[PDB]
Amino acid sequence: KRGPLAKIWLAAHWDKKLTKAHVFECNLESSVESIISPKVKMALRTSGHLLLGVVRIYHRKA
Amino acid sequence: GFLKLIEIENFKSYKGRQIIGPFQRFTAIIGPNGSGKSNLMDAISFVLGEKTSNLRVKTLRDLIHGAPVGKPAANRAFVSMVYSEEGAEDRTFARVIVGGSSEYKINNKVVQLHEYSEELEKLGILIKARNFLVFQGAVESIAMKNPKERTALFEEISRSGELAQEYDKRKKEMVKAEEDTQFNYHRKKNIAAERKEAKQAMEKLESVRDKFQETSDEFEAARKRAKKAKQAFEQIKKERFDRFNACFESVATNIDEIYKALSRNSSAQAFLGPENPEEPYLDGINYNCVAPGKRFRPMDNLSGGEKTVAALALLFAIHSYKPAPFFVLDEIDAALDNTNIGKVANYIKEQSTCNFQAIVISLKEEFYTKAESLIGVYPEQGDCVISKVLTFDLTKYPD
Amino acid sequence: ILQENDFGDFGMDDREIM
Amino acid sequence: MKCLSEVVAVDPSILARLDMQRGVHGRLMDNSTSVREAAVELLGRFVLCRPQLAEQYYDMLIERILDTGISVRKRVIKILRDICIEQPTFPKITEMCVKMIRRVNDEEGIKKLVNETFQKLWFTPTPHNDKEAMTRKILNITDVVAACRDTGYDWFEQLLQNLLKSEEDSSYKPVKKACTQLVDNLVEHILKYEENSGRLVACITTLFLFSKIRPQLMVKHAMTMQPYLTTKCSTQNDFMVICNVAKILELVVPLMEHPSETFLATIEEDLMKLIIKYGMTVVQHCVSCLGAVVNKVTQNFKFVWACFNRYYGAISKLKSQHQEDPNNTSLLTNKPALLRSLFTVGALCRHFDFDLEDFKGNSKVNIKDKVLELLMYFTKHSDEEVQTKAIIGLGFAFIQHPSLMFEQEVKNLYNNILSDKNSSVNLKIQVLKNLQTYLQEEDTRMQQADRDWKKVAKQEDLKEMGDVSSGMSSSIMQLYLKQVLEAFFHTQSSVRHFALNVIALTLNQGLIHPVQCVPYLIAMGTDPEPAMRNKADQQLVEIDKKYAGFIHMKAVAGMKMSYQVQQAINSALCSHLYSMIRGNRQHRRAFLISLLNLFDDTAKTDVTMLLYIADNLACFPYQTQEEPLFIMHHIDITLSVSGSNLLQSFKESLIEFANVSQGILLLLMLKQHLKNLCGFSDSKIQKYSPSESAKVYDKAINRKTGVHFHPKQTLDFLRSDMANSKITEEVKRSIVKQYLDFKLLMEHL
Amino acid sequence: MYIKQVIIQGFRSYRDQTIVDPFSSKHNVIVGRNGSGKSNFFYAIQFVLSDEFSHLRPEQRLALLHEGTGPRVISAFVEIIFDNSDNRLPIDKEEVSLRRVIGAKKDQYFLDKKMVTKNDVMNLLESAGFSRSNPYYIVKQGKINQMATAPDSQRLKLLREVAGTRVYDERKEESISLMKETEGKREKINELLKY
Amino acid sequence: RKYEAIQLTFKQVSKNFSEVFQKLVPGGKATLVMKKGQFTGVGIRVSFTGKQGEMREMQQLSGGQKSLVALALIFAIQKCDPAPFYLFDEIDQALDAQHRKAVSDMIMELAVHAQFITTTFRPELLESADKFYGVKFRNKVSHIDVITAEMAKDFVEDDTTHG
Ligand SMILES: Nc1ncnc2c1ncn2[C@@H]1O[C@H](COP(=O)(O)OP(=O)(O)O)[C@@H](O)[C@H]1O
Ligand SMILES: Nc1ncnc2c1ncn2[C@@H]1O[C@H](COP(=O)(O)OP(=O)(O)O)[C@@H](O)[C@H]1O
Ligand code: BEF
Ligand code: BEF
């Protein structure tokens, strides 16, 4: 919907609206993992969903 | 007659030898939680004999007093009952256990398992039945049983269970005789065919018609073998069929009238459905009843009270076929209101007085308000619990 | 030609009720 | 098919070539959904592009509506909706328009698409212009509801409720306004009718259905058709109009606000005149509305009470005459008056209880006991139609108080009338009518009393759960249902019509056990009338959706009951049983094992049951390969054993021989016909063994044309038998000729 | 939190459950006679919230309609209304309603007149803290005592769910298989890169 | 980070289990022992009526003893972190009136933590409740409404008749 992590929300939860354009170059995986590592107020299950998003997009790049 | 009283030694919070009171036609065992009361039923089943798991215990060396904590009272335990019957005689049976070994006694002399088993059968006690002693949370399961096990219970109560091996043996030589006969039939039909195109040398034709005659004689021998086996399998099915169906039809009848009797109503039905009713002792038997005031639904959907109704109906019907001298009932007033407990209490008051002894455990005061004697038990502290017995008369009170 | 069909409509005869 | 459907949509002038006609017909009757929707889409595109010359194929089109698919029915609805919307005045529209409302309740999606289809088709706002369009819309609706009468009305009112619930908020109330815009126009139609009676009764049934759905409209028009209730001729449709307007006022008078007292009064008296000068059916359907209006607002029930007293005094005079004079001719003179008195007292008992503190108004005499005792006394009468009228009065009085059947002698009345092979057939019909009606009013009253729970919620207790008020309704069946079982074995078919209706509505209420009457329901699934077997299979599959093994329990009992049914009468009749049970391998295997062994080995049954068993066996539609293979294998086993034994005994050696040889011959002929019909090599039959592998013999069977030669030959050899015993030389020649045929069949390969 | 009210139409034993006085935030007691038809409340709300009861055969789903009298219902529903006052529920509103519409084949979820892809309810209730698979905090009629006698493996599973990491296992073994197959793919990439 | 979260929540649950145990059981102590872990089991250890001399296992108990074990674990998690809702279907079945008094007292102890809803056949439990909800089954159908304290207290225990 809105946000740098919104694409990861779509990947974790919807995964149908994703296209090849976002998959190829929209974000660096190594960047976003270190973005998400020190974040405050991070609930456990939402962290699991963000892990879903990053694992899914990494395997899609592969 | 009935069971007079029970004697216990070094078994489940019962130190030493204490004489439990004489048992009237309907008494009760009442006490708060953890008072050590179901163990009395456990001892009843134990002297009757049953596998350890259902007594919430394993390895049968834990049954001694003090063993669940870890320090046994001793390596030595007696349990003993006295059966009282008319004609002024009483029969004193006992079970004698040391460590992991146990034996049986009648009139305080060593009695082996087998003869003990058939004489208690002559008393009227099927120890493979288990259809008379009640567990904590099994009354709901009675209706919710997989039909296989209740089918086996009805099959054994028809005294045919030991005949299962002979029946299945005769069945397998049925199928073997049939396959041998048809195999010979196919083989001689092939021989007749190839001889038919052999007709269109003479020496090989005569040799192969000799082989045809040999195959015909072999098939005839198979026919005599199957014929001899046939009538024997006929009487074996006839006897098992007769025993089982007579049992089934009497159970079906008496459960119908007792079910319509017990719910004080004319508007409920109960039925026991046999799977493959031509020979249903081998296949399952389901059980479906109609509620007093509810629509016809599957029995998995039911609440507790109507399952208790159906279970006690089953119990009283199979009593009405094959009586048990006395009954033990674990807390059958589970989730009921005052009306249903009044129903069952009035039933057992009118029905125990000339058909059966019956003893219960409960907490709801109206159920044993109708009782005529009461067995209190007080638990006591120490290194472990020691429970103590006292008896209370009830047949000297108004209304 | 009548290759792949039902035997009449006997496989297909759910009737109307009242 | 889809592509060539587009091709013929471009060029309709090709649909004459015969091979493609055969292909499209075969795809209409192909065993798959998608080809069926492709072919019906082809035909529908042909119909829309070419309205003419397709009505000859319209019968196939209209029979493709019911196809047990999902998208096929949507497609055919689209086709027929466009047919209706593009060409009016087609000669078979309204009949057409019946059939799909019959499918409105079938699925949720069909329910929707049909609802807005007809809402755009019929129920649009239609502003104050174009009177003729509204006029033939009204005409079409009347033709639909007139054609609706034969089958049943519940479907269309269910549609009406579907539209009613669909607009839960305001949403401008588009149908609702249009709804009243319809009804007064219908009244206007009546206002211009003024003189053809079929169209009048169609209009009054339209008003009837509109009253059934919701009674909020006709409160202003009651006095407009008030003169039409007053007095008409002696014609039956007028009587139906009288019944219907009585029902309509019965609904609408409770809702209309602040009525005129003298209006209700004069309605009351004129409808009592209609009682005293007309037949029984109008009297019932109007005493309903009299009881309603008397016991709904007003308080002048003393006059109707006095009318009851008059009829009671008259029937007291008649019974007192019959006390000492059972042969008095004075009773015959007023015998129809006695019948009318019986109907009147039954109806007055029926509508509401007058054995109360206000209708009597004095010390309680318990007049209900006296009237039931007197009706018992009148039931034992020499003439027949007086006993018919007595049973009518019994049922009507029993409507109000069900505990009255709990008495023993009432049960004696039923079981003595229905059993004993009673010469009269009618009395069974009326008593079963009473049972069916009884179920109907009790269902309706409990359903309506569910709706107004809030008005009675706080004046009733908790600890009781008043259930015997419902339990008695159940309990009465355990008194007589078993009796009803031998009621099923009757030559007359109106008897079985009512009996099946009773048991069907019973299990629809389901206060009885399900699988107790199934072999009867199996047997009368073999009835010549389609509605009978229709309801029978429908109820069977209704259980089958809900309980699995229950019909599998009742397997051979249905066969014996069916044999009894075709005694009562004097392809496979019980094929639908096989159609349901075709899934499970084990239970079907067990059933065929039980059949083939028990009824063909040793049981000395009548040959005729086995004849019709083998008839069905050869005539069951089997679908995969393995089942006839298993049949032939166990046939070969049992046949080799029994035939070898029988031939060796006859060679050693006889009417019993004739019967058992006839049964063996039956088995040979069934085997031979099945082996011809399957068209399979006998060597593979020899190779087969039971339960080899599940996945090997699943192949599709081909059925060849005109193979059914088993019933003719079995009939020939049974007419050769006829269970005949005589000492002629010709019967010995027949025996030895059949023995030679046995030797030949023994020798076949 | 706090359940406001419940609405039932045609579920198992209620034709039309109208609007009644709301519940209390502390404790609400119910008493009835034997067979009162109360387990309908339990099965209804667990059907609204949990997924596992909607996993068995369609036959009893068809038998999961109130078939009392009159017409045969095909379409039922159950609605539940409550307040997300503490905003434990992530949607920002104040009277949140969840209703489930039930057909013979059909089943649809409405959250305040919105269509759901059946995954919004799962992660939504997970954010709320609900477990669709637990026997925790909900007990059947006469099934209260197995959980004490339930052996230790599901005790560890229970405490693992209490930790909230009941997700992380299925996530990680979902990851590992894809990880290994991508190892094979990238190893293939290296030999072909040499090619 | 999940691993030590397991450790901390296990300590929190085991300490809450022991304190709710000593609240409900007037005399005796019971708590969790963690096995060799990785982790493969967690045992339950209860001592009562001597409180040290008694030492028992999982399976040989009374019904009420198992009930109080279960309810103690229920509020071991509840006090560790409350679930949003709680609901009981005759939770007071095997237990006696004294512990029915106990469990109702911990209902009033815990009512601020979470919303509890419960159904029973026994009267002592229902004096720990805010207001009263009544079932009504008539005309082959069920319905819920609101009722009062007094007539409900009459229905549950006072009226002892055929209906
Ligand atoms: N041999 C024994 N010595 C002491 N206590 C025992 C012994 N066997 C069981 N107990 C304990 O006694 C308590 C009472 O329960 P139990 O004797 O099984 O009967 P009930 O279920 O009727 O209370 C339980 O806590 C049980 O673990
Ligand atoms: N599908 C259904 N249609 C109609 N009534 C039903 C249906 N399922 C259950 N019922 C009714 O609901 C009630 C359920 O009672 P029961 O299950 O014994 O109580 P509880 O819900 O307290 O366990 C019964 O009276 C039964 O007739
Ligand atoms: F009405 Be119940 F047995 F919860
Ligand atoms: F566990 Be108990 F005192 F029957």
**CA distances to B20, B134, D723, F146 from B377, in Å:** 10, 20, 79, 43
For residues F103 and F92, the answer to whether their CB atoms sit within 8 Å is: yes
CA of E12 to the centre of ligand 2 (A): 7
Euclidean distance between CA atoms D631 and D617, whole angstroms:
10
Q: What is the 3-state secondary structure (H, E, C) of chain F?
A: CHHHHHHHHHHHHHHHHHHHHHHHCCCEEEEEEECCCCCCCEEEEEEECCCCCCCCCCCCCCHHHHHHHHHHHHHHHHHHCCCCEEEEECCCCCCCHHHHHHHHHHHHHHCCCCEEEEECCCCHHHHCCCEEEEEEEECCEEEEEEECHHHHHHHHHHCCCCC
Contact yes or no for D556 and B278 at CB 8 A: yes
Q: Residue D519, exposed/middle/buried by CB under 10 A (0-12, 13-18, 19+)?
A: buried
Mutate which of D443, D453, D463 to disrupt the F interface (most F C-beta within 10 Å)? D463
Mutate which of E69, E72, E77 to disrupt the D interface (most D C-beta within 10 Å)? E69
- Contact list, D463 vs chain E (CB under 8 Å): 33
* Residue of B207, B285, B214 lying closest to B252 (CA atoms): B285
Question: Nearest-CA distance from D103 to chain C in Å?
Answer: 9
Euclidean distance between CA atoms D244 and D241, whole angstroms:
5
Question: Nearest-CA distance from B292 to chain F in Å?
Answer: 12
The residue to mutate among B144, B296, B297, having the most atoms of ligand 2 within 8 angstroms of its beta carbon, is: B297
How was this entry determined? cryo-EM
- Contact list, F69 vs chain E (CB under 8 Å): 148
Closest residue of chain D to B298, computed from CA coordinates? D547
Task: Map residue E79 onto helix, strand or coil.
Answer: strand
Q: Strands B28-30 and B357-362, how do they pair? A: parallel
Mutate which of E3, E7, E29, E87 to disrupt the F interface (most F C-beta within 10 Å)? E29
Buried/exposed E120-146: b ≥16 CB within 10 Å, e otherwise: ebebbbbbbebbeebbbbbbebbebbe
Residues in Cβ contact with D98 at an 8 Å cutoff, skipping those fewer than 6 apart: D144, D147, D148, D151
Beta carbon of B57 within 6 Å of any ligand 1 atom = no
CA of F160 to the centre of ligand 2 (A): 25
CA of B12 to the centre of ligand 1 (A): 6
Q: Which of B335, B338, B363 sits opposite F96 (nearest CB)?
A: B363
For residues B188 and B219, the answer to whether their CB atoms sit within 8 Å is: yes
Which amino acids bring their CB within 6 angstroms of ligand 3?
B 303; E 32, 34-39, 141
Euclidean distance between CA atoms B144 and D4, whole angstroms:
59
Contact yes or no for E182 and A52 at CB 8 A: no
Residues in Cβ contact with E54 at an 8 Å cutoff, skipping those fewer than 6 apart: E47, E61, E107
Structure's resolution in angstroms? 6.5
Q: Which of A13, A46, A52 sits opposite E171 (nearest CB)?
A: A52
- Contact list, D457 vs chain F (CB under 8 Å): 136, 143, 145
CA of D534 to the centre of ligand 3 (A): 39
CA of D473 to the centre of ligand 2 (A): 19
Question: Nearest-CA distance from D21 to chain C in Å?
Answer: 10
Euclidean distance between CA atoms D450 and E173, whole angstroms:
54
CA of E105 to the centre of ligand 2 (A): 22
- Contact list, D453 vs chain F (CB under 8 Å): 138-139, 141, 143
> Which residue puts its alpha carbon closest to atom 2 of ligand 4?
F62
Chains in touch with C (3+ beta-carbon pairs under 8 Å) read D
Q: Strands B373-380 and B28-30, how do they pair? A: parallel
- Contact list, A48 vs chain E (CB under 8 Å): 167-168, 171
DSSP line for B57-77 = -STTTS-BTTTTTT--S-S-E
Instruction: For chain C, give percent helix, strand, coil, nearest 5.
Output: 0, 0, 100
Q: Is E142 on the interface with B (CB under 8 A)?
A: yes
Q: Which of D475, D547, D686 sits opposite B266 (nearest CB)?
A: D475
Chains in touch with A (3+ beta-carbon pairs under 8 Å) read E
Beta partners for B78? B96
**Longest distance between any two alpha carbons in chain B, whole Å:** 110
Contact yes or no for F85 and E140 at CB 8 A: no
Q: Is E13 annotated as a binding residue?
A: no
CA torsion through residues D525, D530, D535, D541, sign: positive
Q: What distance lies between CA D187 and its chain's CA centroid?
A: 34
Q: Is F18 on the interface with B (CB under 8 A)?
A: no
Backbone angles phi, psi at F136, to 5 degrees: -140, 115
- Write out the two tokens for A45: 């299950």
Number of CB pairs < 8 Å for B and D?
A: 66
For residues F83 and E129, the answer to whether their CB atoms sit within 8 Å is: yes
Question: Nearest-CA distance from E35 to chain B in Å?
Answer: 6
Q: Which of E126, E165, E171 sits opposite A51 (nearest CB)?
A: E171
Contact yes or no for F62 and B38 at CB 8 A: yes
Q: Show the CA angle centred on residue B162, arms to residues B158 and B165, nearest 5°.
A: 125
Euclidean distance between CA atoms E78 and E97, whole angstroms:
11
* Residue of D23, D61, D56 lying closest to D40 (CA atoms): D61
Beta carbon of E39 within 6 Å of any ligand 2 atom = yes
Number of CB pairs < 8 Å for A and E?
A: 28
Q: Is E140 annotated as a binding residue?
A: no
Number of neighbouring beta carbons within 10 Å of residue D734: 15
Strands, E, within chain B: which ranges? 2-9, 17-19, 28-30, 77-85, 89-98, 101-106, 110-111, 270-274, 285-289, 326-330, 357-362, 373-380, 386-393
Euclidean distance between CA atoms E24 and E2, whole angstroms:
7
Q: Is B31 annotated as a binding residue?
A: yes
- Write out the two tokens for A5: 């992590």
Beta carbon of F47 within 6 Å of any ligand 1 atom = no
CA of F65 to the centre of ligand 4 (A): 8
Euclidean distance between CA atoms B311 and B141, whole angstroms:
9
Instruction: State the closest ligand 4 atom to the C-alpha of B331, by its place in the atom list counted from 1.
Output: 4
Q: Strands B89-98 and B101-106, how do they pair? A: antiparallel
Q: Which H or E element spans position D58?
A: helix D58-63
Q: Is B206 on the interface with D (CB under 8 A)?
A: no
Q: Is D463 on the interface with E (CB under 8 A)?
A: yes
* Residue of D145, D140, D143 lying closest to D88 (CA atoms): D140
Number of CB pairs < 8 Å for D and E?
A: 30
Inter-residue long-range contacts of B137-142, CB under 8 Å, 24+ positions, other chains counted:
B137/E142, B137/E145, B137/F63, B139/B307, B139/B308, B139/B311, B139/B330, B139/B331, B139/B332, B139/B334, B140/B304, B140/B307, B140/B308, B140/B311, B140/B334, B140/E142, B142/B307, B142/B310, B142/B311, B142/B314
For residues B38 and B14, the answer to whether their CB atoms sit within 8 Å is: no
Number of H helices and E strands in chain D, helices first, is 36, 0
Q: Which of E123, E171, E186 sits opposite A13 (nearest CB)?
A: E123
Closest residue of chain E to A47, computed from CA coordinates? E168
* Residue of E25, E123, E166 lying closest to E83 (CA atoms): E25
- Write out the two tokens for B65: 């007093």
Closest residue of chain E to F129, computed from CA coordinates? E27
- Write out the two tokens for E112: 């305040």
Residues in Cβ contact with D10 at an 8 Å cutoff, skipping those fewer than 6 apart: none
Euclidean distance between CA atoms B248 and B318, whole angstroms:
10
Q: Is B238 on the interface with D (CB under 8 A)?
A: no
Euclidean distance between CA atoms D33 and D40, whole angstroms:
11
- Write out the two tokens for B383: 């290194």
Q: Strands B373-380 and F28-34, how do they pair? A: unpaired
Question: Nearest-CA distance from A14 to chain E in Å?
Answer: 9
